[PDB]
Structure formats: structure tokens, C-alpha cells
């Protein structure tokens, strides 16, 4: 795994082209996330 940028704990990827996209995030220490919910699903075919 890489290191966080010095003086930071994560990176935020802000979208700069697609106005509808939400942010994405990166952590470099597995201890910074807890898998709270497990969601089982199917994708639905559009009608």
C-alpha cells in the first residue's frame, strides 16, 4: 500500500468533468474502515 500524502489521512477524488458523479475516497490504512453492513442484491433490468 502507498502512504497518504504527508500531513493527510486519506485522498478525496473530486469529479471535475461529470457533473453527476459523487466523490470517491482512498485510505492507506485498513484500520480506517469498518465493514458495517453487508448488502445482498441484484441489479434490475430497466423496463
Amino acid at each position: 500500500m502507498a502512504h497518504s500524502p504527508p500531513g493527510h489521512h486519506s485522498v478525496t477524488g473530486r469529479p471535475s468533468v461529470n457533473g453527476l458523479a459523487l466523490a470517491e475516497y482512498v485510505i492507506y490504512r485498513g484500520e480506517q474502515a469498518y465493514p458495517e453492513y453487508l448488502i445482498t442484491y441484484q441489479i434490475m433490468r430497466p423496463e
Binding site: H9, S10, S16, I27, G30, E31, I39, T40, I43, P46
Partner: protein, 162 residues
């Protein structure tokens, strides 16, 4: 030490998690290549993941980060899709769960859009799709995502063409 507790669909907690899953679907620039073509999901089950050791590992780090950042963990609830979901819920996140080739370097990636994380359920780029039908847009096979508590602390802002 992990147990999974089923949430009832009548539970407010089930309903708020399902709403975040459904409401954060978007269209993707690949036209559905990686994750499939869909506007919504059929939620089959939501389970709470309970592991005391892994929780304490999380809160220990959260306190370290908060103390480095004026008592602010900057904690978010974010989606994660991965072929290693079963490993993660039993052993915790670690370097084996990183996206080595990600655009912000080798780290563990999370998304606000559930449909972004859906693109990674079967691997990077959707891999070869579901194991049964080899279909990245399979409407039959059951998929799993994690909805995760994530400590961001002081986050480096990268403006990026996506």
C-alpha cells in the same frame, strides 16, 4: 469472531441503508460495461457485521486520527465493492484489499455512488462478470456490497477528470 445479524425490512436501519444504496445509483461513462445496465436494485438482504476485535481496531485508529485533526475523525458511510468481501468481513480491511492500480495510488477505495462500487464486485472493470454466466450485467446472480464506516481525517483533495 464475525457474526452477521439480519435486519428486518421493517427496521428503520434497513430502510435508511436501502435508501442510500438506491438513491446513489447513477449512469456510468462506460454505458454499463463494468457494472451492468440498471437504474435500481432488488435488495435481498441487509446484514449487520459484528466483530468486537475489528471494531476496536477501527475505533483505536479513529481516535488517533481525530487527535491529529482537532478532534475530528471526518467519518463517512461509504460503499465498497470487491471480490474479497468475505475475507473483509472476517479479517478486516488490509493491504490485500487495495486497488494497486487506482488513480490515487495503491490504497483501499470507497465510493459515495453505490453504482461505482458495483463496478468492482466481480473485479477491476467488472472482470469477466458473474462466475455462473460470465455476464457483467447479470440480472440473476446475487451480488454483495459493503456499506462501511470510514475515517477520512484530513483528506487531500484531488480534482480529477471523472
Amino acid at each position: 469472531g464475525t457474526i452477521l445479524i439480519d435486519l428486518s425490512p421493517d427496521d428503520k436501519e434497513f430502510q435508511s441503508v436501502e435508501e442510500e444504496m438506491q438513491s446513489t445509483v447513477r449512469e456510468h461513462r462506460d454505458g454499463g460495461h463494468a457494472g451492468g445496465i440498471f437504474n435500481r436494485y432488488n435488495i435481498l438482504k441487509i446484514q449487520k457485521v459484528c466483530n468486537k476485535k475489528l471494531w476496536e481496531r477501527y475505533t483505536h485508529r479513529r481516535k488517533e486520527v481525530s487527535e491529529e485533526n482537532h478532534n475530528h475523525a471526518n467519518e463517512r458511510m461509504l460503499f465498497h465493492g470487491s471480490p474479497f468481501v468475505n475475507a473483509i468481513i472476517h479479517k478486516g480491511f488490509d493491504e490485500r484489499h487495495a486497488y494497486i492500480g487506482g488513480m490515487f495510488g495503491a490504497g483501499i477505495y470507497f465510493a459515495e455512488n453505490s453504482s461505482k462500487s458495483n463496478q468492482y464486485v466481480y473485479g477491476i472493470g467488472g472482470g469477466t462478470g458473474c462466475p455462473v454466466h460470465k455476464d457483467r450485467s447479470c440480472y440473476i446472480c446475487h451480488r454483495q456490497l459493503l456499506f462501511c464506516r470510514v475515517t477520512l481525517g484530513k483528506s487531500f483533495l484531488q480534482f480529477s477528470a471523472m
